[PDB]
Amino acid sequence: SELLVNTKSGKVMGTRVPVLSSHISAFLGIPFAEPPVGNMRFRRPEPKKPWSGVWNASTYPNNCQQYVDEQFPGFSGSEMWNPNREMSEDCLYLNIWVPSPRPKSTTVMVWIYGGGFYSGSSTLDVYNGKYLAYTEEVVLVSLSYRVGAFGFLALHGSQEAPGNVGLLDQRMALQWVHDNIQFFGGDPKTVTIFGESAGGASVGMHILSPGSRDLFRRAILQSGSPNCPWASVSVAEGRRRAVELGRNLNCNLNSDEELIHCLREKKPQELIDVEWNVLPFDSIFRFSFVPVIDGEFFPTSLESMLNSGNFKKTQILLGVNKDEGSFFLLYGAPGFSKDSESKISREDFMSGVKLSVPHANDLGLDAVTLQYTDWMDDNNGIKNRDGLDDIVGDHNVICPLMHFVNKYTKFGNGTYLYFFNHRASNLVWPEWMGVIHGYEIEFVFGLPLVKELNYTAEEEALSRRIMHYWATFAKTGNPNEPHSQESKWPLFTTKEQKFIDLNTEPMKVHQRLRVQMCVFWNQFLPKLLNAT
Amino acid sequence: SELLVNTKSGKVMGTRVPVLSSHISAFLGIPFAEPPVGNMRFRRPEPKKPWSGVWNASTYPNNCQQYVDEQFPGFSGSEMWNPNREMSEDCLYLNIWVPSPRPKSTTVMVWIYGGGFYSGSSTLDVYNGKYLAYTEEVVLVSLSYRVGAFGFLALHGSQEAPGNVGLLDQRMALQWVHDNIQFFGGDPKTVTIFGESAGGASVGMHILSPGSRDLFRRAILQSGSPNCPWASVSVAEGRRRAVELGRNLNCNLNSDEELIHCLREKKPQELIDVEWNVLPFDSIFRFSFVPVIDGEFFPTSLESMLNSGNFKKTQILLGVNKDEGSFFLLYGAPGFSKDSESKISREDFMSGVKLSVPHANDLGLDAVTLQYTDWMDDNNGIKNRDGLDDIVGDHNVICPLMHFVNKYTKFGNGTYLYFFNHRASNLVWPEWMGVIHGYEIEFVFGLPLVKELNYTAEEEALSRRIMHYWATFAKTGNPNEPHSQESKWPLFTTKEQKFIDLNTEPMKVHQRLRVQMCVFWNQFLPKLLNAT
Ligand SMILES: O/N=C/c1nc(CCCCNc2c3c(nc4ccccc24)CCCC3)ccc1O
Ligand SMILES: O/N=C/c1nc(CCCCNc2c3c(nc4ccccc24)CCCC3)ccc1O
Ligand SMILES: O/N=C/c1nc(CCCCNc2c3c(nc4ccccc24)CCCC3)ccc1O
Ligand SMILES: O/N=C\c1nc(CCCCNc2c3c(nc4ccccc24)CCCC3)ccc1O
Ligand SMILES: *[C@@H]1O[C@H](CO)[C@@H](O)[C@H](O)[C@H]1NC(C)=O
Ligand SMILES: *[C@@H]1O[C@H](CO)[C@@H](O)[C@H](O)[C@H]1NC(C)=O
Ligand SMILES: *[C@@H]1O[C@H](CO)[C@@H](O)[C@H](O)[C@H]1NC(C)=O
Ligand SMILES: *[C@@H]1O[C@H](CO)[C@@H](O)[C@H](O)[C@H]1NC(C)=O
Ligand SMILES: [Cl-]
Structure with missing residues (x-):
C-alpha cells in the first residue's frame, strides 16, 4: 500500500x-x-x-x-x-x-x-x-x-x-x-x-x-x-x-x-x-x-x-521582494491606508522614520531622514511614502540579508541571489504596496497553475520557472540545468556580486543589490549609533 | 583740472x-x-x-x-x-x-x-x-x-x-x-x-x-x-x-x-x-x-x-561658480595634475576628503565619504575626482554661502542669487578643473570686451550682461532694469529660493541651489561633529 x-x-x-x-x-x-x-x-x-x-x-x-x-x-x-x-x-x-x-x-x-x-x-x-x-x-x-x-x-x-x-x-x-x-x-x-x-x-x-x-x-x-x-x-x-x-x-x-x-x-x-x-x-x-x-x-x-x-x-539560494516594508507601514504607521494611495505628509514621514528605526538616537534619526529625503521635493507625499517604504524594507530585510550574503559567500560553496519584483495581476492589495513581503510565496508554491485562481499565462510560466529553480537547486545545489538552453542564473561571487530579477520578463543580471542604501544601513549607521 | x-x-x-x-x-x-x-x-x-x-x-x-x-x-x-x-x-x-x-x-x-x-x-x-x-x-x-x-x-x-x-x-x-x-x-x-x-x-x-x-x-x-x-x-x-x-x-x-x-x-x-x-x-x-x-x-x-x-x-547680490574646489585640489591633493585629466584612485580620494575636512573625526570623514561616493562604481576615477571637487566646492564656498543667504534673507531688504557656470573658451587650465574659483572675475571686469584677449562674441555679451547686472544692482538695489523686455532675474525669497544661471545661454531660473548636499554640510555634519 x-x-x-x-x-x-x-x-x-x-x-x-x-x-x-x-x-x-x-x-x-x-x-x-x-x-x-x-x-x-x-x-x-x-x-x-x-x-x-x-x-x-x-x-x-x-x-x-x-x-x-x-x-x-x-x-x-x-x-x-x-x-x-x-x-x-x-x-x-x-x-x-x-x-x-x-x-x-x-x-x-x-x-x-x-x-x-x-x-x-x-x-x-x-x-x-x-x-x-x-x-x-x-x-x-x-x-x-x-x-x-x-x-x-x-x-x-x-x-x-x-x-x-x-x-x-x-x-x-x-x-x-x-x-x-x-x-x-x-x-x-x-x-x-x-x-x-x-x-x-x-x-x-x-x-x-x-x-x-x-x-x-x-x-x-x-x-x-x-x-x-x-x-x-x-x-x-x-x-x-x-x-x-x-x-x-x-x-x-x-x-x-x-x-x-x-x-x-x-x-x-x-x-x-x-x-x-x-x-x-x-x-x-x-x-x-x-x-x-x-x-x-x-x-x-x-x-x-x-x-x-x-x-x-x-550552497544557499536567497533573495528579497521589491517592497518588503509596505505591509508593515499599512498596519503600523500614520498616513497609510489600504483604501488610498497613502501619500504621506512630511510630518507623517518624520513619525514613520521614528517608528521604523526603534533604536536610533536623535543623530541616527537625522541620518536616516537625510538619507531618504529628496530636499528639492520634501513635501511630495508619494516620494515620502515610497521613501519610508524603502526605509523599512532596507533596514529590516534587504540590507540585513546582503550583509549575510556577503559574509557567507566568503566561506560558502555557492550562492544564488534573486530580486523578486513581480506584482501579481490578481493582487488584492493597493498598488502603492508594491511587491509585498510574502507574495512571492504563492509563485514558489505553484498556485498560479490553478486556472480558477485566474493568474495570467505568463504568471503560470513564472511560477514553473521559479519552482524548477528551487527544485533543481534543491537536487543539485545549482538552480540551473547546466548545458541546457535557458539563460543561466549566475553565481553570486565575492567580487562581482551578481543577482537576477525574478519576473515575467527575460532574465536580467545586475550587480550589487542596493549597495548605496545598504552601505548606510550596514556600515555607517551602526558606527553612528555606537558613537556617543 | x-x-x-x-x-x-x-x-x-x-x-x-x-x-x-x-x-x-x-x-x-x-x-x-x-x-x-x-x-x-x-x-x-x-x-x-x-x-x-x-x-x-x-x-x-x-x-x-x-x-x-x-x-x-x-x-x-x-x-x-x-x-x-x-x-x-x-x-x-x-x-x-x-x-x-x-x-x-x-x-x-x-x-x-x-x-x-x-x-x-x-x-x-x-x-x-x-x-x-x-x-x-x-x-x-x-x-x-x-x-x-x-x-x-x-x-x-x-x-x-x-x-x-x-x-x-x-x-x-x-x-x-x-x-x-x-x-x-x-x-x-x-x-x-x-x-x-x-x-x-x-x-x-x-x-x-x-x-x-x-x-x-x-x-x-x-x-x-x-x-x-x-x-x-x-x-x-x-x-x-x-x-x-x-x-x-x-x-x-x-x-x-x-x-x-x-x-x-x-x-x-x-x-x-x-x-x-x-x-x-x-x-x-x-x-x-x-x-x-x-x-x-x-x-x-x-x-x-x-x-x-x-x-x-x-540688498545683496551674490553667487558661486560651478567648480570652486578644482583649483585647491590641484595645488594640495594627491593624484591631481595640471597636465592630466587627474582620474583619482579610491586611495587618493580617501586622502582627498581627509585634507578637505581637516576638522573632522573619523565618523565625520565617513559621513562625507558616504555622501559623495557612488557605491555602484567606487573605482571610477572621474566620479572620484568630481566627487572630491564637489566636496571642496560645497564645503568651503557654496554651502557656507547658502547658509548665509538663507539667514540674511530673513532680515535683508532683497537678495539676488547667481550660479556662474560658463567655462571660458580661451581658458588655460585643463578641462577637468571646470568653472574655476575666481574665473568669473574676468567677466565682472569686462575683459571679454578686449578684442585682443580672444574671447568669443558670446562671452563679450555675457560680460556685458554681467557688468550691467552689477552696475544696475549697485545703482538701484535690483539687477533688473524695470521694463527691459529680456528675462528678469527673480528675487531670492525664504520660501521659493530662486536663483539664476550665468552662462552664454538664455537665463533659466532654479530653486534650492545644491540643497541636498548643503543640508548635509550646513545641518547634518555639524550636528554630527558636535555630537561625537
Ligand atoms: O501593526 N499593528 C499596529 C497596532 N495594532 C493594534 C490592534 C491589535 C491589538 C494589539 N496589537 C498590536 C500592538 C502592537 N503592534 C502590533 C503589530 C501587529 C499586530 C498587532 C499589534 C504594538 C503596541 C501594542 C499592541 C494595536 C496597536 C498597534 O500599534
Ligand atoms: O590649505 N591651503 C590652501 C590653498 N591655497 C591655494 C592658493 C594658491 C594660489 C592662489 N591663486 C589663485 C587665486 C584664485 N583663483 C585661482 C585659480 C587658479 C589658480 C590660482 C588661483 C582666486 C582668488 C585669488 C587667488 C591653493 C591651494 C590651497 O590648498
Ligand atoms: O596646498 N598645500 C600643499 C603644499 N604646497 C606646497 C608648495 C610649496 C610652498 C608652501 N606653501 C603652501 C602651503 C600650503 N598650501 C599652499 C597653497 C598654495 C600655495 C602654497 C601653499 C598648505 C600646507 C603648508 C604650505 C608645499 C607644501 C604643501 O603641503
Ligand atoms: O509590524 N508588526 C507586525 C505586523 N503584524 C500584523 C498582523 C499579522 C498579519 C501578517 N500577515 C502577513 C504576513 C506576510 N505578508 C503579508 C502581506 C500583506 C498582509 C499581511 C501579511 C508574510 C509573512 C507572514 C505574515 C500585520 C502587520 C504587521 O506589520
Ligand atoms: C481518517 O479521517 C478522515 C477524515 O474524517 C476520514 O475520511 C477517514 O475515514 C478516517 N480513516 C479512518 C480509518 O478512520
Ligand atoms: C565547492 O567545493 C568543491 C570541492 O570541495 C570545489 O571544487 C568547488 O569549486 C566549490 N564551489 C564553489 C562555488 O565554491
Ligand atoms: C610720477 O611723476 C610723473 C608725472 O608727473 C610720471 O611720469 C612718473 O612716471 C611718475 N613716477 C614714477 C617713478 O614713475
Ligand atoms: C524692504 O524691502 C521690501 C521689499 O524687499 C520693500 O517693502 C521696501 O523696499 C523695504 N521696506 C521698507 C519698510 O523700507
Ligand atoms: Cl604668549
Whole structure:
C-alpha cells in the first residue's frame, strides 16, 4: 500500500489527494514531538513517544497558539495568513506530500513558515505543497513550531524556559525527517530547508547553529536572514520582556520558578492578549518573543560567527521582494491606508522614520531622514511614502540579508541571489504596496497553475520557472540545468556580486543589490549609533 | 583740472587712460592710511597724514607683502594672481577710475580683492576697472589691505597686535571713499562694495561689523561669505597660531610685548617663509592668519549675529561658480595634475576628503565619504575626482554661502542669487578643473570686451550682461532694469529660493541651489561633529 507507512514512532495512514488532473499522496498532521502542554509550556520539546495502531494522517493538524490579525475582517489579503485550523498548544505536527508512485531516494524540501516568530501556520492555503511536490517530483515537508511567548520566552539560566525552544521545535522536526523521510521516498542526505520572513531567518539560524547543521543539506532564504534586527534579542533583553510579561499579568516576580509557574497557570490567549505590551518602543517590524543569542543554540554573537566562518559551508539560494516594508507601514504607521494611495505628509514621514528605526538616537534619526529625503521635493507625499517604504524594507530585510550574503559567500560553496519584483495581476492589495513581503510565496508554491485562481499565462510560466529553480537547486545545489538552453542564473561571487530579477520578463543580471542604501544601513549607521 | 582733484588729505593728479577706442580718468596709488611699517606693523591703520603739493597718482602702488605662488612658474593661469609690482609693507593705497567727463554724484563700486586673506593685490590685470567704469558709467574704486601675518596676526588682549587690522584697513579705505569720493564725481550715499573669495567674505564681514555698516549702501559677494570655514578663527586659535609663528623664529614667548617686539624685528619674507607652518592640520583651503571673532569687530559669534539679525539690512547680490574646489585640489591633493585629466584612485580620494575636512573625526570623514561616493562604481576615477571637487566646492564656498543667504534673507531688504557656470573658451587650465574659483572675475571686469584677449562674441555679451547686472544692482538695489523686455532675474525669497544661471545661454531660473548636499554640510555634519 502506497498510503500506509511505518515510521520509527508508529504506523501512519495518509490520503490520496488530487493535483492538476493527477494525484499524489499526502500525510498530514504527523506528530513529531510530545505536546508542549501543562508543565512543558516553554520547555524544550521532547521526542514524540511511539504510538500503537495507525495514525490518521489525512487531516491538517491544529495551529499553534498565536495572535490572530483582525485588522481587516474577512479580507482575503490578510486572512490568508491567519490560522485556518483550531488553535492549541498541542501543535507540533508536520505534513508530507509524496509523489505517486513513490520515488526511490528523491530530493526533500522542508518548508518553515514565517509570521515574525509570533504567528504562522503550516496549513495555510498558500503553503499547499501538492503543486510543488507533484510538478518537480520532490518530497515536500511542512514543519511547524511554537511561536510567540510559548515558543520563545527566554529566561537565560532557567531550564524550564531557556529560550529558542521554537527553534528547537524545528530542529526536532528536521531530526524526525532525518530518521523517517526514507520511508516516504525521501533521501535524508538531500534535504533543502527553505522558509520565508521569520522562516528564512530560521533557515539562516540552522545554518549557524551547530546542533542543526547536520540535519539538512542546502538552504533557501526568502525575505529573511539570521541577522535581521527583528530576528533575535540579547539574553538581558529577553529576560526583561519575559519578566515584563509576568508583571503584565500580576505574576509574582521574585524568582524564575515562581514567574514561570504563574505564566504556566495562564490560558494561552491571556499571554497573547498582552504579548505586544513588552516591546521597548513604539515599533514597526518588531516582535516580542524571538530567538535569543544564548551561548548554546548560538555559540557566540551572530556577527563573530559570520566573521569566523563558524557555520555550515554549503550552497544557499536567497533573495528579497521589491517592497518588503509596505505591509508593515499599512498596519503600523500614520498616513497609510489600504483604501488610498497613502501619500504621506512630511510630518507623517518624520513619525514613520521614528517608528521604523526603534533604536536610533536623535543623530541616527537625522541620518536616516537625510538619507531618504529628496530636499528639492520634501513635501511630495508619494516620494515620502515610497521613501519610508524603502526605509523599512532596507533596514529590516534587504540590507540585513546582503550583509549575510556577503559574509557567507566568503566561506560558502555557492550562492544564488534573486530580486523578486513581480506584482501579481490578481493582487488584492493597493498598488502603492508594491511587491509585498510574502507574495512571492504563492509563485514558489505553484498556485498560479490553478486556472480558477485566474493568474495570467505568463504568471503560470513564472511560477514553473521559479519552482524548477528551487527544485533543481534543491537536487543539485545549482538552480540551473547546466548545458541546457535557458539563460543561466549566475553565481553570486565575492567580487562581482551578481543577482537576477525574478519576473515575467527575460532574465536580467545586475550587480550589487542596493549597495548605496545598504552601505548606510550596514556600515555607517551602526558606527553612528555606537558613537556617543 | 579734470585730472587734478583736491581731496581732504591733499591734491592728487591722475592720468588719462584709453579704453576701447575711448578714454577715461585713473587715479592710481592714492594713499588712504599711514604706512604700517616697523613699529606700526600688526597695529591698527592710522589715517594718512595730509600732504603738500600734488601726489603723482598715475602709476599702480606697491603690493602688500605676501606669499608668491611658484608652483607653475611663468604659467599664465597662476601668474595672473601674483603681485605685479614691488612688495612693501607700505602698501595701503587705493585706485579710482572715473568716466570722462566727470559725472555728478554717480554710483560707486569698491572692489575688495580675495586670496584667502594671505595674498592678493589691487593691481592685477583682471582687477583693471577702466572697462567696468567706462561701460557702466560708474566710479570704480579698488582698495588694498594687509594680508597674512601683517594683516591678521591676532594676540587678543593686546593693542599692539589685536587682529583684524586687515579688515580695518578695508574699513579705513571705505571711510576714505565716504569722505573723498564726492570730489571724484562719486556719490558716497550709493557705494557698493564687492569682492571675491576672501573679498566676498570681507564684504560679508562688513555687513555684520557695526563699525562698518555706514560706510557703504549695499553688497556683492562672489564665491565667499563671512561664515566660510576658512574665513575666521577664534581668539584662542589666533593666539595659538601667533605664538607658534613666534616659536618658528625662536622669538621670546614670555609675553605679547616680547613676542611682538621680536616679530617686528624680522624681515617680511622671514615671516612669510614660516607662515604656513602654523596650521593645526594638513589641510586644503585653509589659511594661517585670518580674521578673529574678537568681540569688537564682530560683537558676538557670526552665527548668533546672523540669528538675531545683528547686521546691516539692505540688498545683496551674490553667487558661486560651478567648480570652486578644482583649483585647491590641484595645488594640495594627491593624484591631481595640471597636465592630466587627474582620474583619482579610491586611495587618493580617501586622502582627498581627509585634507578637505581637516576638522573632522573619523565618523565625520565617513559621513562625507558616504555622501559623495557612488557605491555602484567606487573605482571610477572621474566620479572620484568630481566627487572630491564637489566636496571642496560645497564645503568651503557654496554651502557656507547658502547658509548665509538663507539667514540674511530673513532680515535683508532683497537678495539676488547667481550660479556662474560658463567655462571660458580661451581658458588655460585643463578641462577637468571646470568653472574655476575666481574665473568669473574676468567677466565682472569686462575683459571679454578686449578684442585682443580672444574671447568669443558670446562671452563679450555675457560680460556685458554681467557688468550691467552689477552696475544696475549697485545703482538701484535690483539687477533688473524695470521694463527691459529680456528675462528678469527673480528675487531670492525664504520660501521659493530662486536663483539664476550665468552662462552664454538664455537665463533659466532654479530653486534650492545644491540643497541636498548643503543640508548635509550646513545641518547634518555639524550636528554630527558636535555630537561625537
Ligand atoms: O501593526 N499593528 C499596529 C497596532 N495594532 C493594534 C490592534 C491589535 C491589538 C494589539 N496589537 C498590536 C500592538 C502592537 N503592534 C502590533 C503589530 C501587529 C499586530 C498587532 C499589534 C504594538 C503596541 C501594542 C499592541 C494595536 C496597536 C498597534 O500599534
Ligand atoms: O590649505 N591651503 C590652501 C590653498 N591655497 C591655494 C592658493 C594658491 C594660489 C592662489 N591663486 C589663485 C587665486 C584664485 N583663483 C585661482 C585659480 C587658479 C589658480 C590660482 C588661483 C582666486 C582668488 C585669488 C587667488 C591653493 C591651494 C590651497 O590648498
Ligand atoms: O596646498 N598645500 C600643499 C603644499 N604646497 C606646497 C608648495 C610649496 C610652498 C608652501 N606653501 C603652501 C602651503 C600650503 N598650501 C599652499 C597653497 C598654495 C600655495 C602654497 C601653499 C598648505 C600646507 C603648508 C604650505 C608645499 C607644501 C604643501 O603641503
Ligand atoms: O509590524 N508588526 C507586525 C505586523 N503584524 C500584523 C498582523 C499579522 C498579519 C501578517 N500577515 C502577513 C504576513 C506576510 N505578508 C503579508 C502581506 C500583506 C498582509 C499581511 C501579511 C508574510 C509573512 C507572514 C505574515 C500585520 C502587520 C504587521 O506589520
Ligand atoms: C481518517 O479521517 C478522515 C477524515 O474524517 C476520514 O475520511 C477517514 O475515514 C478516517 N480513516 C479512518 C480509518 O478512520
Ligand atoms: C565547492 O567545493 C568543491 C570541492 O570541495 C570545489 O571544487 C568547488 O569549486 C566549490 N564551489 C564553489 C562555488 O565554491
Ligand atoms: C610720477 O611723476 C610723473 C608725472 O608727473 C610720471 O611720469 C612718473 O612716471 C611718475 N613716477 C614714477 C617713478 O614713475
Ligand atoms: C524692504 O524691502 C521690501 C521689499 O524687499 C520693500 O517693502 C521696501 O523696499 C523695504 N521696506 C521698507 C519698510 O523700507
Ligand atoms: Cl604668549
